[PDB]
C-alpha cells in the first residue's frame with residue numbers, strides 16, 4: 001500500500017531499521033505507511049538509490065544535504081531533526097574542535113597535528129574546520145584533499161579516497177563510509193581522539209556528552225576556541241567554531257512521498273521519541289549511536305514545501321560550502337562591486353532591465369523570475385542582488401533576511417531628502433454606483449493590486465479583518481481580482497491578463513493601474529494608492545479603457561462611512577503606506593546603494609527627454625522595476641532595517657494579518673528556530 005523505502009547505511013543501520021519497521025507495524029493501522037529497509041554501503045549510494053527510485057528517504061548532515069540537492073540528484077529536505085528539548089527546540093547545532101586537556105596547542109597550531117573527522121563533506125567534521133584553515137593551506141589548494149593531507153600529519157576522514165590521498169586514512173585505513181568502521185561519524189571521530197590516534201576531533205558539542213556520562217571523565221577534554229584559547233567542554237556556547245543547520249531527511253523533488261515520510265516520522269516520534277521508553281527507541285540503539293537519526297535529536301519538524309536545499313541551508317552556510325569546493329579565497333581582497341544584478345518580473349520588466357543593462361555598460365545585470373517571491377528567493381541565495389518592492393513585500397523580504405537599501409521618494413525631486421512618511425492608501429468606487437460604502441463591502445466585487453501589497457491588500461484586508469475576525473476574504477467579497485491568489489477562489493474570478501491571476505504584469509489587472517482598470521470594467525471597489533485616479537484619468541493614460549475617463553466619475557470610501565471626491569484623499573484615506581524600497585542582502589547593500597545613487601545621476605528625474613535617453617523611473621508600460629511616479633531613490637538615514645524602515649505601525653498591522661498569510665516564502669523564512 002503506502003510504503004516508505006528507508007535507506008540504511010550498512011549493517012548496524014540495517015538492524016535498527018528492522019526494529020523500526022516491526023515496531024511501527026504494531027502501532028500503525030494496516031494502511032499506516034509501512035517501512036521497507038534498503039541497505040546501501042554509504043550515504044552517497046543512498047542518495048543515488050533515492051534518485052533512481054530504489055528508496056525514498058535518508059537522514060543526512062546539512063553538508064551532505066547540499067550535496068544531495070545538486071544535479072542530477074536534486075533531492076530536497078522534507079523533515080528536519082531538532083535539538084535541545086521539546087519545549088525549546090533548535091534547528092542548528094555547534095561545530096566544535098575537541099581536544100585532550102593538557103595537550104596545550106591552540107587553533108592556530110593544527111599544522112602538523114593528527115586529525116579525526118566525522119566524514120568528508122559534513123558540517124562539523126569537514127566543512128567548518130577545513131573552511132577556516134583553507135586560506136592558509138599549502139598554495140595548491142586543488143584538489144582540497146591533497147592540501148588537507150599535507151597540512152595534517154595523518155587523519156581519519158571517513159568517505160575520502162584513500163587511493164589518491166592515503167594520509168587522510170592513516171588513522172583509519174580504508175576511510176570506510178559507515179558505522180561499521182569504528183572511527184566513522186560523530187562517535188568514530190570521538191573514539192579516534194579518545195584512543196589517542198589523533199590530537200583533535202571535529203565533532204558537535206553533544207558528542208562528548210553522549211559518549212561520557214560523568215563530568216569527571218569529561219574533565220579530561222577541552223575545546224579549542226577561535227581566539228586561540230582553550231575552554232572546558234561545557235562552555236561550547238562561548239567556544240565553538242560555527243553554528244550549522246540540522247540534519248535532515250531528504251527525498252526526491254517530485255514523487256518523493258514527503259507526506260508518507262512525514263506521517264511515519266510524526267507517528268514514530270509520538271510513540272518512540274525521547275520521552276517514551278521501550279524496547280525500541282528512535283533516538284537510540286544498542287547497535288550504535290546516531291543510527292538513522294542522531295541520538296541528540298529530540299524530534300522532527302515538517303519542512304515547508306517552498307524550502308529547497310539552498311533555502312534550507314541558508315546563504316552563509318551555502319556560500320561557505322560553495323567557496324570551499326570552489327577554492328575561492330577571500331584573502332586581503334577588494335571590489336566585488338563590479339556590476340549589480342537586478343531581479344525582474346515577467347517579460348516587460350526584463351526588457352526594461354536589458355535596456356538598462358546595455359546603456360550602463362554592464363553596471364546593471366538582469367536576472368528574471370515570474371513572481372515577486374521567486375525574485376526575493378533569487379536574491380536570498382545570491383542568484384540576484386537587488387529589486388525594488390512595495391512595503392508589503394519588503395516585510396516578507398525582511399523576514400527572509402534582506403535589508404532595505406534605498407527608498408523611492410514620490411513628493412520631491414531633491415534626492416537628498418529623507419524618505420517620506422509614505423503614500424496614501426485609498427478605496428475607490430464609481431460615482432455611478434450609489435449604494436456602496438465602507439460599511440457595505442460584504443458581498444461586493446473587489447479589485448486589488450495583488451495579494452500581499454500594501455494598498456491592495458495589507459491595509460484594506462487588515463482593517464476588514466479586525467471587523468470580520470476570520471480569514472476567508474474570498475467569502476466576504478462575492479468575487480474579485482487579487483492577483484497572487486489561488487487560481488480557483490472567488491478572488492481570481494475577475495482577472496484577465498493572459499496569465500490569469502498571476503502576481504505580475506501578465507495579468508492585466510495587476511498593480512495600481514491594473515486594479516483601477518479592474519474597477520473601471522468589472523469591480524465595485526479598487527484598493528490602490530491615492531494618486532492612481534489622477535494618473536489614469538484626463539487623458540494622462542492613453543489606453544482605450546482610460547482615455548476618456550474623468551476624475552469626477554469616481555469617489556473614495558472614508559472610514560466613517562461617507563464618500564468624497566478623489567481630490568480629498570488627504571481627509572479620506574484608509575492609512576499611510578511606507579514607500580516602496582530597494583532591497584538586497586547585507587553582504588551587498590553598500591555596493592548596491594552606491595551604484596544606484598550614481599546611476600540616478602544620469603538616468604533619474606534629470607533626463608529631460610525619456611524617448612531619447614534612458615530613464616529609470618519611466619516605463620514603457622506601467623511601473624516596471626520602479627514606480628513611474630518615482631522621483632528619487634533616497635538614502636534611508638539609519639533606517640537600514642525593515643522593522644526600522646517600515647515602522648512600528650505598519651509592522652503591527654501586517655502582523656495582525658499573519659494568521660491569514662498564504663505566502664509560501666514567508667513560512668519558509670520562518671521555519672528555522674535559532
Ligand SMILES: [Cl-]
Pocket residue numbers: 118184185186187290
Ligand atoms: Cl554520525
Ligand SMILES: [Fe+3]
Pocket residue numbers: 061062122123124247
Ligand atoms: Fe552533522
Ligand SMILES: [Fe+3]
Pocket residue numbers: 390391453454455577580
Ligand atoms: Fe505600494
